Amino acid sequence: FENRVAEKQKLFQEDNGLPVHLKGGATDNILYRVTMTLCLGGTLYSLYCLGWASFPHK
Amino acid sequence: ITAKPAKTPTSPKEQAIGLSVTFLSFLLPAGWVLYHLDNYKKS
Amino acid sequence: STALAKPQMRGLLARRLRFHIVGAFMVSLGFATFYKFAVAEKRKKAYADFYRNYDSMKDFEEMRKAGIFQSAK
Amino acid sequence: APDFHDKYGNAVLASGATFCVAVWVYMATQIGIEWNPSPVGRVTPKEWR
Amino acid sequence: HETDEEFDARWVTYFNKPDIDAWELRKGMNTLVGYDLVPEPKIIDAALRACRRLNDFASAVRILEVVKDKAGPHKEIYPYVIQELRPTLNELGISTPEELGLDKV
Amino acid sequence: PSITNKRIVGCICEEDNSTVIWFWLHKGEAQRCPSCGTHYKLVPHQLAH
Amino acid sequence: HYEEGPGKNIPFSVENKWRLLAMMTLFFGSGFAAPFFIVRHQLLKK
Amino acid sequence: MAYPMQLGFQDATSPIMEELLHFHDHTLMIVFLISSLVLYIISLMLTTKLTHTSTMDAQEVETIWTILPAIILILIALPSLRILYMMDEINNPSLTVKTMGHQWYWSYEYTDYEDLSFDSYMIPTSELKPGELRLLEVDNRVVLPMEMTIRMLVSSEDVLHSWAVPSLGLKTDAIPGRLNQTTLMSSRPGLYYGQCSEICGSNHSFMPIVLELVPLKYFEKWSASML
Amino acid sequence: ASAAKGDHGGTGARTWRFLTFGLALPSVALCTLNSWLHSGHRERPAFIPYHHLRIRTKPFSWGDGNHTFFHNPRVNPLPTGYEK
Amino acid sequence: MFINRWLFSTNHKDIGTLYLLFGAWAGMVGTALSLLIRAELGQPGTLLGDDQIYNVVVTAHAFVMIFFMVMPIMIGGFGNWLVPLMIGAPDMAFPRMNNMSFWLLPPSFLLLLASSMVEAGAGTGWTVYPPLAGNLAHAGASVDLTIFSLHLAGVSSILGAINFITTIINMKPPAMSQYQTPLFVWSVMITAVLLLLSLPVLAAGITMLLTDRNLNTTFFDPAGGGDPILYQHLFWFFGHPEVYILILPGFGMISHIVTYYSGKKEPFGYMGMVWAMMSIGFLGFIVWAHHMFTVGMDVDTRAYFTSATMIIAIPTGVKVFSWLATLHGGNIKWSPAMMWALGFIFLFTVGGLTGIVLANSSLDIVLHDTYYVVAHFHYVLSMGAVFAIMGGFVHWFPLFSGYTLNDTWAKIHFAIMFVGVNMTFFPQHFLGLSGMPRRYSDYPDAYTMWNTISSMGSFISLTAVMLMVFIIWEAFASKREVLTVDLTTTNLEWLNGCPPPYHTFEEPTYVNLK
Amino acid sequence: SVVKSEDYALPSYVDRRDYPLPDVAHVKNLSASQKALKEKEKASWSSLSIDEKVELYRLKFKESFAEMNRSTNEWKTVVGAAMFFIGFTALLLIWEKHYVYGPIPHTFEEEWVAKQTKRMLDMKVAPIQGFSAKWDYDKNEWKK
Numbered sequence A: 001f002e003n004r005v006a007e008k009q010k011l012f013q014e015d016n017g018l019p020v021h022l023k024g025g026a027t028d029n030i031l032y033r034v035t036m037t038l039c040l041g042g043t044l045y046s047l048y049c050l051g052w053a054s055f056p057h058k
Numbered sequence B: 001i002t003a004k005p006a007k008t009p010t011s012p013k014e015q016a017i018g019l020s021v022t023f024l025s026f027l028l029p030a031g032w033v034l035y036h037l038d039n040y041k042k043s
Numbered sequence C: 001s002t003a004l005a006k007p008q009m010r011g012l013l014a015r016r017l018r019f020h021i022v023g024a025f026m027v028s029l030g031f032a033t034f035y036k037f038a039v040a041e042k043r044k045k046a047y048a049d050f051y052r053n054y055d056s057m058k059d060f061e062e063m064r065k066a067g068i069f070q071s072a073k
Numbered sequence D: 001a002p003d004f005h006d007k008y009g010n011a012v013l014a015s016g017a018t019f020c021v022a023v024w025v026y027m028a029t030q031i032g033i034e035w036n037p038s039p040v041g042r043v044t045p046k047e048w049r
Numbered sequence E: 001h002e003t004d005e006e007f008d009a010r011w012v013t014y015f016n017k018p019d020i021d022a023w024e025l026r027k028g029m030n031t032l033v034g035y036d037l038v039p040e041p042k043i044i045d046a047a048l049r050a051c052r053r054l055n056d057f058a059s060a061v062r063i064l065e066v067v068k069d070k071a072g073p074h075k076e077i078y079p080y081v082i083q084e085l086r087p088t089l090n091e092l093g094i095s096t097p098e099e100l101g102l103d104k105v
Numbered sequence F: 001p002s003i004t005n006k007r008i009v010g011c012i013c014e015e016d017n018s019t020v021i022w023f024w025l026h027k028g029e030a031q032r033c034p035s036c037g038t039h040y041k042l043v044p045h046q047l048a049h
Numbered sequence G: 001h002y003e004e005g006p007g008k009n010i011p012f013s014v015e016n017k018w019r020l021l022a023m024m025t026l027f028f029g030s031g032f033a034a035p036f037f038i039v040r041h042q043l044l045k046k
Numbered sequence H: 001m002a003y004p005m006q007l008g009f010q011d012a013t014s015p016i017m018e019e020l021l022h023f024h025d026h027t028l029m030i031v032f033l034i035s036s037l038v039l040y041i042i043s044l045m046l047t048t049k050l051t052h053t054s055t056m057d058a059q060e061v062e063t064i065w066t067i068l069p070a071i072i073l074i075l076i077a078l079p080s081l082r083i084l085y086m087m088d089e090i091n092n093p094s095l096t097v098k099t100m101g102h103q104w105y106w107s108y109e110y111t112d113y114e115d116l117s118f119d120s121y122m123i124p125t126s127e128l129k130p131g132e133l134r135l136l137e138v139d140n141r142v143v144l145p146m147e148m149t150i151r152m153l154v155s156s157e158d159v160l161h162s163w164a165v166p167s168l169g170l171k172t173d174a175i176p177g178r179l180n181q182t183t184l185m186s187s188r189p190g191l192y193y194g195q196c197s198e199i200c201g202s203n204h205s206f207m208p209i210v211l212e213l214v215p216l217k218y219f220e221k222w223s224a225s226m227l
Numbered sequence I: 001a002s003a004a005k006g007d008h009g010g011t012g013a014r015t016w017r018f019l020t021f022g023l024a025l026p027s028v029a030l031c032t033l034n035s036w037l038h039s040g041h042r043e044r045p046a047f048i049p050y051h052h053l054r055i056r057t058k059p060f061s062w063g064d065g066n067h068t069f070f071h072n073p074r075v076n077p078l079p080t081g082y083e084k
Numbered sequence J: 001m002f003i004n005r006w007l008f009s010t011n012h013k014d015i016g017t018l019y020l021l022f023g024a025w026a027g028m029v030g031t032a033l034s035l036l037i038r039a040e041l042g043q044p045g046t047l048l049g050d051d052q053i054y055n056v057v058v059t060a061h062a063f064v065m066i067f068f069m070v071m072p073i074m075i076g077g078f079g080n081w082l083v084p085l086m087i088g089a090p091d092m093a094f095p096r097m098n099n100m101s102f103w104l105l106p107p108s109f110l111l112l113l114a115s116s117m118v119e120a121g122a123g124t125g126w127t128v129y130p131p132l133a134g135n136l137a138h139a140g141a142s143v144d145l146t147i148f149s150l151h152l153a154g155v156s157s158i159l160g161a162i163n164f165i166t167t168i169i170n171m172k173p174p175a176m177s178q179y180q181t182p183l184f185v186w187s188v189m190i191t192a193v194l195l196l197l198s199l200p201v202l203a204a205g206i207t208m209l210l211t212d213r214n215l216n217t218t219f220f221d222p223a224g225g226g227d228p229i230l231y232q233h234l235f236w237f238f239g240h241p242e243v244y245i246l247i248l249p250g251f252g253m254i255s256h257i258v259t260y261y262s263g264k265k266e267p268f269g270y271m272g273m274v275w276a277m278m279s280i281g282f283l284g285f286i287v288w289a290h291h292m293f294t295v296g297m298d299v300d301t302r303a304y305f306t307s308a309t310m311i312i313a314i315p316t317g318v319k320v321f322s323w324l325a326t327l328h329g330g331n332i333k334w335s336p337a338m339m340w341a342l343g344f345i346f347l348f349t350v351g352g353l354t355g356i357v358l359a360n361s362s363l364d365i366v367l368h369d370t371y372y373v374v375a376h377f378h379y380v381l382s383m384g385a386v387f388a389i390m391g392g393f394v395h396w397f398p399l400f401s402g403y404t405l406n407d408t409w410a411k412i413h414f415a416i417m418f419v420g421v422n423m424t425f426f427p428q429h430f431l432g433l434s435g436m437p438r439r440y441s442d443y444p445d446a447y448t449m450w451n452t453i454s455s456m457g458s459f460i461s462l463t464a465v466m467l468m469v470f471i472i473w474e475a476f477a478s479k480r481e482v483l484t485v486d487l488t489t490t491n492l493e494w495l496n497g498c499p500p501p502y503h504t505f506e507e508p509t510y511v512n513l514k
Numbered sequence K: 001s002v003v004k005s006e007d008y009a010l011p012s013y014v015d016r017r018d019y020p021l022p023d024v025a026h027v028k029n030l031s032a033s034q035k036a037l038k039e040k041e042k043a044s045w046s047s048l049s050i051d052e053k054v055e056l057y058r059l060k061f062k063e064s065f066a067e068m069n070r071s072t073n074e075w076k077t078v079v080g081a082a083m084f085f086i087g088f089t090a091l092l093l094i095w096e097k098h099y100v101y102g103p104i105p106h107t108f109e110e111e112w113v114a115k116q117t118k119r120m121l122d123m124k125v126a127p128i129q130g131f132s133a134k135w136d137y138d139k140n141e142w143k144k
């Protein structure tokens, strides 16, 4: 292996106004959208589950 | 503490409205449930 | 056209505190004395007086005759 | 220059106190609330057995 | 700490500094009123004259007001102080808050 | 030192005081601690060349 | 960056006192009402 | 039992409960004294135009307000601990009775000689006989001999409960798998009430305890007849 | 553990003095209170000439050779029992 | 921008604001639950149903008031807002983790509401003791949802504690020693240390209840050699420190309020105040079994816990007398905040003293599980903790918002609340001494009078809570912008204006070492 | 005179009994006649008129001590309003008793209470101080 930290330091210090969680590139955006979609979707699903469990199925 | 006069003064009439609305927001829903308590207890 | 006497001008707050703390102490003592008479002693004498010539069998007999018991009619 | 308190203070105190006393006395004695006071001095013991 | 006379002397000396500036005047009065005492007339005299050297009439009057205030419910203090300060008030031409109507709400 | 024309100063008047005296120090003539009178003077700007 | 100052460092708007009254009413009212409706829910199950 | 508008403790039925009444009077005096002293000092600090806003020294007055409370705490702890150990004293009972807590009633067992046991349920309000107390009466009372040292063993066959009789100064938790001991000794005959003192579910408010204290002779005939 | 206090921003002389007078000495004062309370001479037990106690395989190099170094008449019996 | 600012925040002020909003909403829920309690007890008989629905209400009331109202407001709200400003720090040490501490609360609250929605709720008492809380006496998801709610609230507070301790130790000006930080900052650090040490034990304990309920373990089940009393020890080992966690930040705010409105530059006996809070924090970890005086413990163990418990009165006493000593000689400003603080001093003292009565295991035999305990804790919580919160709220509201409240209305609010809480709880002392048990949906006829009066007092408090909402609305509706604040030389949090800018102390304060 | 929001970093004026001499003068900007008064102030104060002295005071300070320490009628408003809201609370209680609460248990009926009271006296409830102790068993009445 070779030391490529300087390349990474240049990329992450590039003045493009991007927050650190998106500064790596397009993949950050994809990973973020997947994470947030699973989180919000899963939360809606948990609310549905609570609605289901709230009522007796005799 | 010193402060400047109100930028959007709330007159006595406006305060009566805010106080009334505030009290009603607490009293009405609970009052409704409490009033229909018997209808709930056995139904 | 009379002059005025130099009054006390130093430690007036401290002087006031001292006076009233001493008064608070005196009132605490008077309350202790009162309480240990209207409550403490009153209680000890009420129990001592009640049990002095207490007859438990007589008491039971009265309760029995009144019919309060399940085991004794 | 007279403020809210100078103008309305006495009225607010007077009618506030009056209203409070009136409505509480009414609630306490005219609506069927059971306070369940002590029988001591008020109830004449009646045969139960 | 120190004796009453050493305290007073320290204060009189403070206000008597010929070139005392406005800041030092305020600092002295603002600090002095924090103690459990009404300043002796000799202290007040020195402060009033410092006001004269600083051409500050308003502060002279305010100092008289704070003396009265520090007495709290002891109404016999202020009139005695004003009595002891009369020669100075006359000399400097300082009108008491009462004479200016600043004692009325 | 300051990179602007005012900076908050905290003065621990005497060693071991638990109370810190806080005040804004402005560009210009030296100011004194409201409590002990020690002098402070702002010397503005630069840092980053 | 963000807005600063009175009425700007909050997640709700205070531009209109009446719209604000409505918001506060729903906010605090929903909190206070919740237990009553949960009690009602428990009573209407069995 | 408690009577309408009661302020303090139910009258003491046992010597230990009498002991607690005197200890409480002692402590309450201290509570009144200190709380009124604080209220008084607050009013004292707030009622003067005189001021002293400069730095005040503390290492002198802190001795007073550290030593005094320390002394007062000791004056409470002494009689407190004396009573505590007194309640633990070896007494040697004449009788042992067990009580098992259940989801919503108490069962009793007197198994020294015979195998006597029964359930004790609250009398429903709709079935109370005239003059009977709502929520407090039971169908089968705990008959016990008066003026005698009795050992009560408490446990539970389901959840936690707590066996209490205020007039006697008793409260022993009923824990499944555990046998807790307490001693009972009534100075007088009569009926003494208590209520379950550990949340146990749906009818926690409705599983009272009623002790019936009678002379030994009646206790024995009652025992025989209850077989 | 972390105790239930806090400081740690810089443990110095002032802090250790604070601990000395605010925690350590008060603890010693309490234990001194507790001890000079639960004291009181306990009733000495009946003497039983157990063979595993009051051992004497060689006389002590002091006194009459039969008394232990810090012998207390009130609570230490000799091999033959308590003293007069 | 809205989402970036309010959902992705890394700002201590905005996060403190979220906490204050959450805590205010939780307070409404907790108040409603307390009214349901007092409505059921307002007259003899059954109103709602049996002890199950009743105790589901009592349990939730406690969890909501403690975990969702008091802690979030005092620590998350006032703590986040004031701590960095009081030490001149640019933000908290872990600004992003700080945001997760907040966001764990809504989910935690949702789990608590879920537990009361499914099955028959968790009517266990906030202590959640087994076997009642076990899978046989409380079968179904309710108790498990309650445990999970506590887990989330626990993680939130533990991460919050790590953040506060690190910030307070590591981010003060280089010249400022720990003995130069304000008392509120000290109260928060000590509180954080208690949270750090106590919550993991509770987590251990409730995880064991969860496994007993779902994985067939038997930590608290005698059938497998377990013991219900073990749970009590683990719970109370956390439980007592928890009550000091609820009052410590209150003590901190009281010190600032009393000092401020007495026109003083500093509280009387600063080092004695620090000593007292640390002692209280320490002693609070070795007295837990005073919650177990009737479970059947050895007499010597009971003698120890009685004695250790009483000692706390000494350091607490130094604080009370120091607050009075701070008032001494002051130029008293009778502001609404000062009124809350004065009420706090007296009412907390009363509650503390009844706590000393309860410390006596002998007397506690008769007082345990009765309304005497309820009276004690409501005096220190509903009067102590709540008055400190109200005082701090009225005092700092202008700082947080940039607007002033109407002082007259705020004094009216205090008057109503004062009558309300005292009428509600004072009579409960009588009910306790005379034997009324805790967690009862109905009571023997003799207890009617005091229960009637107590329920009426609770309605007076409801009126004060509704008025409070209106007061806050009036402030925001009128928009009276703050100009000047006095005593900034000894109250750094006000030095950057009202409200301070998003970013404060970008250029740190200058403090000489001399 | 007129204070601004963004002036929080600058020395300000305050009227306080314990801080008699504020950091700044109440009025900093002077008119032609006011400037002239400040000049006249440099000469003997004996030459200054009462009106001029009052004006010099008013330039330096906003309120006199008498003015700033004045008491008000606010307490009337506070106490009266508190009572009105406490009174309003009773209306909520009236509503509750009427629409929410059903009848109380039959054990509160007068006849039941009279019987229950005799029974309590028969079982000698609280005979030392609390209840039975207040009944005269000999004269068969409540002790006078």
Ligand SMILES: CCCCCCCCCCCCCCCCCC(=O)OCC(COC(=O)CCCCCCCCCCCCCCCCC)OC(=O)CCCCCCCCCCCCCCCCC
Binding pocket: G009, G010, G011, G012, G013, G023, G024, G026, G027, G030, G034, J006, J013, J017, J018, J020, J021, J022, J023, J024, J025, J106, J109, J110, J113, J397, J400, J401, J472, J499
């Ligand atoms: C639950 C929310 C209620 C919904 C109502 C909102 C409707 C939006 C319409 C939408 C119409 C669009 C209008 C847009 C702008 C204004 C409204 C706003 O932006 O909308 C939302 C904003 C603003 O909030 C409001 O809307 C009004 C609040 C007014 C508060 C006044 C508070 C005064 C006290 C002082 C606080 C400190 C400030 C002082 C200092 C100043 C700060 C520096 O909130 C937030 O984004 C963050 C708050 C998060 C959490 C707080 C507690 C929630 C607990 C929930 C747990 C539930 C568990 C299950 C529970 C399930 C129930 C069964």
Ligand SMILES: CCCCCCCCCCCCCCCCCC(=O)OCC(COC(=O)CCCCCCCCCCCCCCCCC)OC(=O)CCCCCCCCCCCCCCCCC
Binding pocket: H007, H008, H009, H028, H031, H032, H035, H036, H039, J350, J354, J422, J423, J426, J427, J429, J430, J433
């Ligand atoms: C609303 C309740 C109505 C109750 C009416 C009582 C009826 C009397 C029948 C009159 C009938 C007389 C015959 C009865 C005698 C039986 C004596 C006994 O064996 O029973 C003993 C019992 C009974 O108690 C008594 O021996 C009476 C004491 C009453 C104290 C009343 C204070 C009232 C303050 C007013 C508002 C309350 C909130 C104030 C807060 C005080 C905090 C506790 O003792 C207790 O354990 C109860 C109190 C417990 C704990 C409080 C400790 C701190 C008190 C602080 C005082 C501040 C004063 C400043 C002045 C207070 C300024 C605010």
Ligand SMILES: CCCCCCCCCCCCCCCCCC(=O)OCC(COC(=O)CCCCCCCCCCCCCCCCC)OC(=O)CCCCCCCCCCCCCCCCC
Binding pocket: H039, H042, H043, H044, H046, H047, H048, H049, J334, J339, J340, J342, J343, J344, J346, J411, J414, J415, J416, J418, J419, K069, K070, K071, K072, K073, K074, K075, K076, K078, K079, K082, K083, K086
């Ligand atoms: C040797 C000593 C004797 C000296 C005699 C006095 C001389 C005075 C020197 C003189 C020393 C200086 C005094 C004056 C300074 C400034 C006066 C003024 O310019 O400013 C005017 C202000 C100033 O206010 C006052 O000034 C007095 C108000 C005091 C409120 C204290 C609240 C305390 C809460 C904590 C309780 C425990 C401690 C209480 C302790 C209180 C101690 C005073 O006027 C108000 O409007 C505010 C008060 C409003 C309402 C009362 C509070 C409600 C309490 C709860 C019950 C409500 C029942 C009603 C509702 C009823 C419904 C049923």
Ligand code: HEA
Binding pocket: H034, H038, H068, H069, H070, H072, H073, J127, J243, J244, J246, J247, J290, J291, J309, J310, J312, J313, J314, J316, J317, J318, J320, J348, J349, J350, J351, J352, J353, J355, J356, J358, J359, J360, J364, J367, J368, J369, J373, J376, J377, J380, J381, J384, J385
């Ligand atoms: C804010 C919360 C808070 C605080 C600070 C306290 C503080 C104290 N508590 Fe309380 N307590 C609770 C909340 C609180 N408590 C809760 C919620 C419960 C019930 C839990 C449940 O079961 O659900 C409870 C239960 C409880 C019990 C168990 C009772 C039982 O269940 O049978 C005991 C036992 O000793 C007790 C004691 C104390 C003591 C001695 C203090 C001390 O810290 C108080 C010290 C203060 C003072 C003493 C006053 C000021 C001092 C002076 C003016 C000096 C002079 C004083 C003397 C010389 C005495 N508390």
Ligand code: HEA
Binding pocket: J020, J023, J024, J026, J027, J028, J030, J031, J034, J035, J037, J038, J058, J059, J061, J062, J065, J066, J069, J070, J073, J124, J125, J126, J127, J374, J378, J381, J382, J385, J386, J389, J390, J393, J421, J424, J437, J438, J439, J440, J441, J458, J461, J462, J465
């Ligand atoms: C902090 C804790 C807290 C608070 C404040 C309260 C407040 C109140 N509680 Fe309490 N209560 C408990 C904690 C609390 N309680 C606990 C721990 C239990 C025991 C549970 C168990 O047994 O398991 C209990 C039990 C309990 C019982 C006993 C139940 C039983 O044994 O059957 C009763 C009975 O009357 C009761 C009543 C009330 C009432 C009427 C109030 C009223 O005083 C409430 C009035 C309203 C407020 C004081 C809230 C105001 C605050 C806000 C709304 C925030 C405002 C916003 C900002 C300033 C930002 N509570």
Ligand SMILES: CCCCC/C=C\C/C=C\C/C=C\C/C=C\CCCC(=O)O[C@H](COC(=O)CCCCCCCCCCCCCCCCC)COP(=O)(O)OCCN
Binding pocket: I068, I069, I070, I071, I072, I076
């Ligand atoms: C007060 C607390 C401090 C303890 C020491 C103080 C005084 C004692 C004198 C010297 C002790 C030094 C080391 C310990 C050696 C032997 C144990 C002594 C501990 C002690 O003092 O024990 C006492 C016995 O004394 C005895 O025999 C004591 C007889 C004295 C004989 C000393 C014999 C010396 C043997 C030394 C061997 C040393 C070899 C050292 C090697 C080091 C490494 C090379 C106990 O008294 P007791 O009456 O039996 O019971 C009390 C009944 N009321």
Ligand SMILES: CCCCC/C=C/C/C=C\CCCCCCCC(=O)O[C@H](COC(=O)CCCCCCCCCCCCCCC)COP(=O)(O)OCC[N+](C)(C)C
Binding pocket: C010, C011, C014, C017, C018, C021, E001, E002, E003, E004, E007, E008, E035, E036, E037, H041, H055, H056, H057, H061, H064, H065, H068, H069, J321, J324, J325, J328
């Ligand atoms: C349950 C147990 C508790 C019960 C009771 C405890 C109450 C204690 C009662 C009395 C305390 C007596 C303290 C004595 C201090 C003297 C006060 C004084 O006068 O205050 C200052 C001393 O500084 C100083 O100690 C600092 C100023 C005052 C120091 C002490 C003030 C606080 C007193 C307590 C406040 C009330 C709260 C009590 C709590 C119960 C004054 O300074 P000097 O005169 O040098 O300078 C002035 C200039 N000269 C020289 C010209 C006069």
Ligand SMILES: CCCCCC/C=C\CCCCCCCCCC(=O)O[C@H](COC(=O)CCCCCCCCCCCCCCC)COP(=O)(O)OC[C@@H](O)CO
Binding pocket: J093, J094, J095, J096, J097, J098, J151, J152, J155, J158, J162, J200, J203
């Ligand atoms: C299923 C039953 C209940 C489940 C509960 C689950 C709860 C949460 C799960 C999801 C959380 C995971 C996400 C990662 C969290 C990492 C936090 C972290 O690593 O936080 C760090 C701080 O804590 C530090 O260092 C040191 C501290 C590190 C803490 C690591 C966080 C772990 C979370 C769990 C903790 C459990 C509590 C343990 C006690 C029993 C960094 O601080 P930041 O503010 O980010 O940055 C500051 C910048 O200057 C850094 O460049």
Ligand SMILES: CCCCCCCCCCO[C@@H]1OC(CO)[C@@H](O[C@H]2O[C@@H](CO)[C@@H](O)[C@H](O)[C@@H]2O)[C@H](O)[C@H]1O
Binding pocket: B027, B028, B029, B030, B031, B032, B034, B035, J035, J036, J039, K092, K095, K096, K099
């Ligand atoms: C503890 C917190 C609660 C405190 C007490 C609440 C204070 C009173 C609030 C009033 O609320 C209501 O009052 C009603 C009656 O006064 C109801 O009307 C109802 O009753 C009727 C009139 O008798 C009908 O006209 C309608 O069908 C009706 O639902 C009603 O729904 C409810 O909103």
Ligand SMILES: C[C@H](CCC(=O)O)[C@@H]1CC[C@@H]2[C@H]3[C@H](O)C[C@@H]4C[C@H](O)CC[C@]4(C)[C@@H]3C[C@@H](O)[C@@]21C
Binding pocket: A033, A036, A037, A040, J003, J007
């Ligand atoms: C920014 C927002 C987060 C909102 C929030 O914090 O509550 C994020 C960013 C990207 C995500 C979205 C992604 O674009 C993927 C999803 C698929 C669709 O193409 C649009 C909506 C969609 C379902 C998502 C909704 C949105 O709310 C997400 C989850």
Ligand SMILES: C[C@H](CCC(=O)O)[C@H]1CC[C@@H]2[C@H]3[C@H](O)C[C@@H]4C[C@@H](O)CC[C@]4(C)[C@@H]3C[C@@H](O)[C@@]21C
Binding pocket: A001, A002
């Ligand atoms: C490639 C690298 C040399 C440094 C470099 O990257 O230039 C070498 C040096 C030491 C490392 C090795 C170490 O000797 C330890 C390991 C030993 C081997 O048995 C397996 C791989 C092993 C896990 C490592 C893999 C290897 O590729 C490493 C990573």
Ligand SMILES: C[C@H](CCC(=O)O)[C@H]1CC[C@H]2[C@@H]3[C@H](O)C[C@@H]4C[C@H](O)CC[C@]4(C)[C@H]3C[C@H](O)[C@]12C
Binding pocket: H059, H060, H062, H063, H064, H066, I014, I017, I018, I021, I022, I026, J271, J272, J275, J318
């Ligand atoms: C030594 C330490 C800090 C002093 C300082 O560095 O300023 C001070 C702070 C608080 C003091 C303690 C508190 O004042 C409480 C106690 C008061 C008694 O007067 C002596 C012991 C007592 C336990 C004090 C001992 C010691 O003087 C402490 C612990």
Ligand SMILES: C[C@H](CCC(=O)O)[C@H]1CC[C@H]2[C@@H]3[C@H](O)C[C@@H]4C[C@H](O)CC[C@]4(C)[C@H]3C[C@H](O)[C@]12C
Binding pocket: J230, J233, J289, J300, J301, J304
């Ligand atoms: C309560 C706890 C046991 C918890 C459990 O059963 O799991 C026990 C463990 C050790 C006990 C302590 C230690 O045995 C030492 C002390 C012994 C004394 O007899 C009483 C207090 C004393 C300080 C004990 C109090 C209490 O019983 C402790 C703290």
Ligand code: CUA
Binding pocket: H101, H102, H104, H160, H161, H162, H196, H197, H198, H199, H200, H201, H203, H204, H205, H207
């Ligand atoms: Cu059985 Cu409660």
Ligand SMILES: [Cu+2]
Binding pocket: J239, J240, J243, J287, J288, J290, J291
């Ligand atoms: Cu505890």
Ligand SMILES: [Mg+2]
Binding pocket: H162, H197, H198, J294, J368, J369
């Ligand atoms: Mg219990």
